[PDB]
Design an enzyme around this catalytic site. Sequence first.
Site, PDB file in Angstrom:
ATOM      1  N   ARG D  48       0.843  -1.193   0.000  1.00 26.18           N
ATOM      2  CA  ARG D  48       0.000   0.000   0.000  1.00 26.18           C
ATOM      3  C   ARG D  48       0.881   1.247   0.000  1.00 26.18           C
ATOM      4  O   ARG D  48       1.516   1.560   1.011  1.00 26.18           O
ATOM      5  CB  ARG D  48      -0.933  -0.026   1.209  1.00 26.18           C
ATOM      6  CG  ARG D  48      -2.007   1.035   1.241  1.00 26.18           C
ATOM      7  CD  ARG D  48      -2.818   0.866   2.511  1.00 26.18           C
ATOM      8  NE  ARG D  48      -3.813   1.913   2.697  1.00 26.18           N
ATOM      9  CZ  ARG D  48      -4.593   2.012   3.763  1.00 26.18           C
ATOM     10  NH1 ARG D  48      -4.511   1.150   4.764  1.00 26.18           N
ATOM     11  NH2 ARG D  48      -5.482   2.998   3.826  1.00 26.18           N
ATOM     12  N   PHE D  53       1.653  10.448   1.665  1.00 26.29           N
ATOM     13  CA  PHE D  53       1.165  10.051   2.975  1.00 26.29           C
ATOM     14  C   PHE D  53       2.078   9.045   3.667  1.00 26.29           C
ATOM     15  O   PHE D  53       2.747   9.423   4.637  1.00 26.29           O
ATOM     16  CB  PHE D  53      -0.254   9.513   2.812  1.00 26.29           C
ATOM     17  CG  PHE D  53      -0.947   9.210   4.095  1.00 26.29           C
ATOM     18  CD1 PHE D  53      -1.217  10.215   5.008  1.00 26.29           C
ATOM     19  CD2 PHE D  53      -1.413   7.934   4.348  1.00 26.29           C
ATOM     20  CE1 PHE D  53      -1.876   9.932   6.186  1.00 26.29           C
ATOM     21  CE2 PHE D  53      -2.076   7.641   5.521  1.00 26.29           C
ATOM     22  CZ  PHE D  53      -2.311   8.640   6.437  1.00 26.29           C
ATOM     23  N   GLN D  56       3.032   1.616   3.419  1.00 26.61           N
ATOM     24  CA  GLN D  56       2.861   0.438   4.260  1.00 26.61           C
ATOM     25  C   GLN D  56       3.586  -0.737   3.622  1.00 26.61           C
ATOM     26  O   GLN D  56       3.398  -1.018   2.435  1.00 26.61           O
ATOM     27  CB  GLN D  56       1.389   0.094   4.445  1.00 26.61           C
ATOM     28  CG  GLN D  56       1.141  -0.898   5.556  1.00 26.61           C
ATOM     29  CD  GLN D  56      -0.327  -1.187   5.741  1.00 26.61           C
ATOM     30  OE1 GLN D  56      -1.168  -0.659   5.014  1.00 26.61           O
ATOM     31  NE2 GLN D  56      -0.647  -2.029   6.715  1.00 26.61           N
ATOM     32  N   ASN D  95      -1.080  -0.198  12.294  1.00 26.41           N
ATOM     33  CA  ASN D  95      -2.023  -0.592  13.324  1.00 26.41           C
ATOM     34  C   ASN D  95      -3.291  -1.146  12.684  1.00 26.41           C
ATOM     35  O   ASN D  95      -3.545  -0.961  11.493  1.00 26.41           O
ATOM     36  CB  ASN D  95      -2.350   0.581  14.248  1.00 26.41           C
ATOM     37  CG  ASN D  95      -2.405   0.173  15.702  1.00 26.41           C
ATOM     38  OD1 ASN D  95      -2.459   1.015  16.591  1.00 26.41           O
ATOM     39  ND2 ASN D  95      -2.373  -1.132  15.957  1.00 26.41           N
ATOM     40  N   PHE D 106       5.243   1.110   8.498  1.00 27.75           N
ATOM     41  CA  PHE D 106       5.061   2.077   7.428  1.00 27.75           C
ATOM     42  C   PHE D 106       5.993   3.267   7.595  1.00 27.75           C
ATOM     43  O   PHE D 106       6.192   3.771   8.703  1.00 27.75           O
ATOM     44  CB  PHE D 106       3.593   2.547   7.319  1.00 27.75           C
ATOM     45  CG  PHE D 106       3.107   3.404   8.466  1.00 27.75           C
ATOM     46  CD1 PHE D 106       2.621   2.824   9.621  1.00 27.75           C
ATOM     47  CD2 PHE D 106       3.065   4.789   8.348  1.00 27.75           C
ATOM     48  CE1 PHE D 106       2.154   3.606  10.665  1.00 27.75           C
ATOM     49  CE2 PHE D 106       2.605   5.575   9.387  1.00 27.75           C
ATOM     50  CZ  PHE D 106       2.142   4.980  10.541  1.00 27.75           C
ATOM     51  N   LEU D 115      -2.406  10.892  12.849  1.00 24.08           N
ATOM     52  CA  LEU D 115      -1.661   9.641  13.042  1.00 24.08           C
ATOM     53  C   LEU D 115      -1.207   9.341  14.481  1.00 24.08           C
ATOM     54  O   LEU D 115      -1.613   8.321  15.048  1.00 24.08           O
ATOM     55  CB  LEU D 115      -0.450   9.632  12.102  1.00 24.08           C
ATOM     56  CG  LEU D 115      -0.414   9.024  10.693  1.00 24.08           C
ATOM     57  CD1 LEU D 115      -0.521   7.532  10.734  1.00 24.08           C
ATOM     58  CD2 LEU D 115      -1.552   9.512   9.874  1.00 24.08           C
ATOM     59  N   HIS D 119      -0.981   5.573  16.722  1.00 20.11           N
ATOM     60  CA  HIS D 119       0.091   4.740  16.181  1.00 20.11           C
ATOM     61  C   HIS D 119       1.375   4.904  16.982  1.00 20.11           C
ATOM     62  O   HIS D 119       1.649   5.962  17.554  1.00 20.11           O
ATOM     63  CB  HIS D 119       0.361   5.030  14.700  1.00 20.11           C
ATOM     64  CG  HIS D 119      -0.830   4.842  13.818  1.00 20.11           C
ATOM     65  ND1 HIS D 119      -1.163   3.620  13.276  1.00 20.11           N
ATOM     66  CD2 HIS D 119      -1.790   5.704  13.413  1.00 20.11           C
ATOM     67  CE1 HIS D 119      -2.258   3.744  12.548  1.00 20.11           C
ATOM     68  NE2 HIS D 119      -2.660   5.000  12.615  1.00 20.11           N
TER      69      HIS D 119
END
Lengths: 69, 242, 49, 159, 98
Positions: D48, D53, D56, D95, D106, D115, D119
Amino acid sequence: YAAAQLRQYHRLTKQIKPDMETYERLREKHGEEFFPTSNSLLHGTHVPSTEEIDRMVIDLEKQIEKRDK
Amino acid sequence: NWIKYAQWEESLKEIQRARSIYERALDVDYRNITLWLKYAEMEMKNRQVNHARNIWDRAITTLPRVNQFWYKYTYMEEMLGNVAGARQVFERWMEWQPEEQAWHSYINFELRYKEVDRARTIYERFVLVHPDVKNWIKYARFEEKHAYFAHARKVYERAVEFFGDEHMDEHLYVAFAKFEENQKEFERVRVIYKYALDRISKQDAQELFKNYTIFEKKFGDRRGIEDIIVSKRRFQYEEEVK
Amino acid sequence: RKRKRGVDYNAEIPFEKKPALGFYDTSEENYQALDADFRKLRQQDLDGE
Amino acid sequence: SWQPPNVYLETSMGIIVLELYWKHAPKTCKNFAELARRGYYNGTKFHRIIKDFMIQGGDPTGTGRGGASIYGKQFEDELHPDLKFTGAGILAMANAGPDTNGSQFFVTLAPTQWLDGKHTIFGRVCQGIGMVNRVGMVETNSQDRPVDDVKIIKAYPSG
Amino acid sequence: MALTSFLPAPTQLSQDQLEAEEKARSQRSRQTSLVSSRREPPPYGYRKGWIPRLLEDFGDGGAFPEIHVAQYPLDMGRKKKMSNALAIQVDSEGKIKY
């Protein structure tokens, strides 16, 4: 057409040759960048100065002016 | 007809209309070399450098064999002084393995900016892509001019190894004799000429003989000079007799 | 006007196929408009000599 | 229960080296180093990648639902009052909710503020940050999946 | 058969070659003496009280989460303008996907 273009190319490259100063000035400050490979990320970031663009246009006219003959 | 319409809009400075005419014209015959040129020229004149770049970059991907595009693109970067960017266009070009003349333009680029050691590396790559006797002489003489004789000899040694078992051109040996002449290794020179004379026919070896007879006229004794000349004359008179 | 075709080429760029766009940003740079000068321009001047 | 230095990632694009804070979240660091040691990331990919951003990465299933741990499928959080999601190149444990962390990390590409509510940070990237951006410039789709394989070749808990 | 077996190994060198061999070896050594760009210092390891402010400070890069100032290594994370350029996307370990 290739050969006359080549002769043109040899003529054009020899007329740009006296501009050593801009090359020499660039080489020190941009020596970390000056040597890129084909996979280096420099492509797409170069923003040339307006005066360099102007020099190109004038020189293009010189090619046209030859082509006129 | 498309070019006439686009040039008329260019005269009116209605660049946004001119752009669309060229793109539509590419949809009918993308292969027409002159169409790409006219489109790219128009953007360059009006200082729209990034538009022109996108046109050149598209052109080299679709039409890699049209050599003219590569030359013109580098020529833009060279006038802009983007020596770094120019190389990227050159490097991506060499991937396709273009004709000999293209390489020489890349070689001369480094030579214009005195990057001797890089020019060497390009020469090595060039000779491997184009293994012709002419290129080996060019490379060898290049090292010789800069007095790096330890490198130059190796180029000659590799050349006589590579060609020697397949083909034997007198042109290489005349050049290599001149190298050892500069080295003053007259004994090595005579070995080179004998090795050539024993294998190449005397009727083709006249220019071989001519340099050799001048060579002996520079450093050989009169006795040695006459014997090589007599043997040539003996061959000539034998041809007369036959 | 009683026509199905004609006047459309004056309202907009008629068949605006966009330039392809990639690797250099060029949404920024743009061009000087046509200098009109409607006190010297002639019909012969637009077509050229 | 030993404390290795900096973890070498060896991605398909290049090398990236992660620094890990033994000062603040040692349990995640032991977990991350051990999975790097045994070879649990050798072949896992950056599944991902959302532009500007985060990235992941790390799952043997390649789904973004998989992963276990060395404790087994879950362990608690270490929401430390020092580490704040600030700039690109922070390394952080991905998470699925409160106190449930598997084996998916990530690396972050921009300042994010919502965030650090939920996290755990443990790390930051320290070698070849431009290569992260090259991973950042990878073609996406509707589900933000890469077309090619951006996978981690090997990983070393060196030092 | 090549002249490398008919010409003796380079035990034959004229005095000009001896000087030139030393000159050619030194010339190679001189051309690589251009160290070029001296690179940036790495950040401090015991980061208490230090705050990165310039692009130089990052050195190798990466933002420091323990330092409570907004960091933008290589201008990443800054709000970019509406650029129409499609992403210069690079394959796995190959060349740039042109």
